């Protein structure tokens, strides 16, 4: 179905700190769901390491 | 015979015709909103449930 | 790789169309936001059940009424269209309303001794007035998908439907209402995390403790979307036509072939064998009435000319 296994095809780096990051194709506007629901995940419980 | 009634349409018109339209003027930006206490203004974006 | 995919949790059934599963423990805030995702799927795009098409015993359009009823048809059909059910073979059933004689007209006057569960056996349509009066119809019904009103295609929707063949509000989606609520975590190990609570209520087509995966799939199958990173796409393949020598400048007339072939290759518009020389054999299976024998004639009638199939060229 149009949940067409929508892999992250189009990333476009800007130099070793930043890319465009895009996810396609989506259900007649469904970037409105993912871009606010999943974007909260990306601010909740994430990896890396630092001073404590 | 209020439907099959006729009326004169003045010298210059034998007949007249009409159509009526139920225009479903949906929720959209640029349209205007308010509340009872004098707050009045334009709908200025539609926001995903989490964009709020 | 450290996924969690949690299971098993809770039950609180209330009445067939509403039950109340809930979720704890949750990590530090998850229950505060996640219940807004399904608020799209459990409205717009869901499979479930609806009426698709109707044909009636003396009523060419719903914008009207029938001389013997005690109620009137447009604002009846607005209530009839909600009759949505379940089906257990192939997706469709063309049901019938079988009704004659004095009194109410109901979901108990409809064909129901087959692969179908009419979960609405208390719906009512109208009345009849004499012991020989009638109201009857065919009723196409599917599980289908979406929230489709009786005008959605918006053009080619003037379409030639034999006058009385009503297209219908195929609103297959078994929910519009869905929402959620929250607590602190209450699992007696803790008082120190969060907890999700669900308030789904339905079209009666299902209960919230009966089935779910396709109704959460535009959120679960949105994960492969970020990994396993191979994708999907289609091409352009033709050239702009045409010049000498007139070996390609010929219709099917030149081939010496049969008549049903000459009707369906005419529908498939191949009025120059200059492109029948290079169209793929699988790409002739693209219009019906063109099957296993006509598709097999092509394989030597082209060769009989002193030509062949399978001859792409860099200029035509």
Swiss-Prot record, chain C:
Residues carrying ADP-ribosylarginine: 260
SUPFAM superfamilies referenced in this protein's UniProt entry, alphabetically: C-terminal domain of RNA polymerase alpha subunit, Insert subdomain of RNA polymerase alpha subunit, RBP11-like subunits of RNA polymerase
Chain intervals for the UniProt region annotation (Required for interaction with Crp at class II promoters): 157-160
Catalytic activity: RNA(n) + a ribonucleoside 5'-triphosphate = RNA(n+1) + diphosphate
PTM entry text: Acetylated on Lys-292 and Lys-293 in the presence of glucose. PatZ controls acetylation of Lys-293 but not of Lys-292. (Microbial infection) ADP-ribosylated on both alpha subunits by the phage T4 protein ModA. ADP-ribosylated on only one of the alpha subunits by the phage T4 protein Alt.
Class of enzymatic activity (EC top level): transferase
UniProt cross-references to InterPro entries, sorted A to Z: DNA-dir_RNA_pol_insert, DNA-dir_RNA_pol_RpoA/D/Rpb3, DNA-dir_RpoA, RBP11-like, RNAP_asu_C, RNApol_insert_sf
GO cellular component: cytoplasm; cytosol; cytosolic DNA-directed RNA polymerase complex; membrane; transcription elongation factor complex
Its biological purpose: DNA-dependent RNA polymerase (RNAP) catalyzes the transcription of DNA into RNA using the four ribonucleoside triphosphates as substrates. This subunit plays an important role in subunit assembly since its dimerization is the first step in the sequential assembly of subunits to form the holoenzyme. Part of the processive rRNA transcription and antitermination complex (rrnTAC). The complex forms an RNA-chaperone ring around the RNA exit tunnel of RNAP. It supports rapid transcription and antitermination of rRNA operons, cotranscriptional rRNA folding, and annealing of distal rRNA regions to allow correct ribosome biogenesis.
Family in the record: Belongs to the RNA polymerase alpha chain family.
Protein name, UniProt field: DNA-directed RNA polymerase subunit alpha
Organism: Escherichia coli (strain K12)
Name of encoding gene: rpoA
């Amino acid at each position: 179905t149009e949940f067409l296994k929508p892999r992250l095809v189009d990333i476009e780096q800007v130099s070793s700190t930043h890319a465009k990051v895009t996810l396609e194709p989506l259900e007649r506007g469904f970037g409105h769901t993912l871009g606010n629901a999943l974007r909260r995940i990306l601010l909740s419980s994430m990896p890396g390491c630092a001073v404590t | 015979r209020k439907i099959t009634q006729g009326d004169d349409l003045a010298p210059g018109v034998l007949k007249i015709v009409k159509v009526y339209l139920a225009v479903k003027r949906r929720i959209q930006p640029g349209d205007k909103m308010a509340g009872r206490h004098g707050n009045k203004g334009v709908i200025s974006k539609i926001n995903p449930i989490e964009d709020m | 790789t450290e996924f969690l995919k949690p299971r098993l949790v809770d039950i609180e059934q209330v009445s067939s169309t509403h039950a109340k599963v809930t979720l704890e423990p949750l990590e530090r805030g998850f229950g505060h936001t996640l219940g807004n995702a399904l608020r799209r799927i459990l409205l717009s795009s869901m499979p479930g059940c609806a009426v698709t098409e109707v044909e009636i015993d003396g009523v060419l359009h719903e914008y009207s009424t029938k001389e013997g009823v005690q109620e009137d048809i447009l604002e009846i059909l607005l209530n009839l269209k909600g009759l949505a059910v379940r089906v257990q073979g192939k997706d469709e059933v063309i049901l019938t309303l079988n009704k004659s004689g004095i009194g109410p007209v109901t979901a108990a006057d409809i064909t129901h001794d087959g692969d179908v569960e009419i979960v609405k056996p208390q719906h009512v349509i109208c009345h009849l007035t004499d012991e020989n009066a009638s109201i009857s119809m065919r009723i196409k019904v599917q599980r289908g998908r979406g929230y489709v009103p009786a005008s959605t295609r918006i053009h080619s929707e003037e379409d030639e439907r034999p006058i009385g063949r009503l297209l219908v509000d195929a609103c297959y989606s078994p929910v519009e209402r869905i929402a959620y609520n929250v607590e602190a975590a209450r699992v007696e190990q803790r008082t120190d995390l969060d907890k999700l609570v669900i308030e789904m209520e339905t079209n009666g087509t299902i209960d919230p403790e009966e089935a779910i995966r396709r109704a959460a799939t535009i959120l679960a199958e949105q994960l492969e979307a970020f990994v396993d990173l191979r994708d999907v796409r289609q091409p352009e393949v033709k050239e702009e036509k045409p010049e000498f020598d007139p070996i390609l400048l010929r219709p099917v007339d030149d081939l010496e072939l049969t008549v049903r072939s000459a009707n369906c290759l005419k529908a498939e518009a191949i009025h120059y064998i200059g492109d029948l020389v290079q169209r793929t054999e699988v790409e002739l299976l693209k219009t019906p009435n063109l099957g296993k024998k006509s598709l097999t004639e092509i394989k030597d009638v082209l060769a009989s000319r002193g030509l062949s199939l399978g001859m792409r060229l860099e200029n035509w």
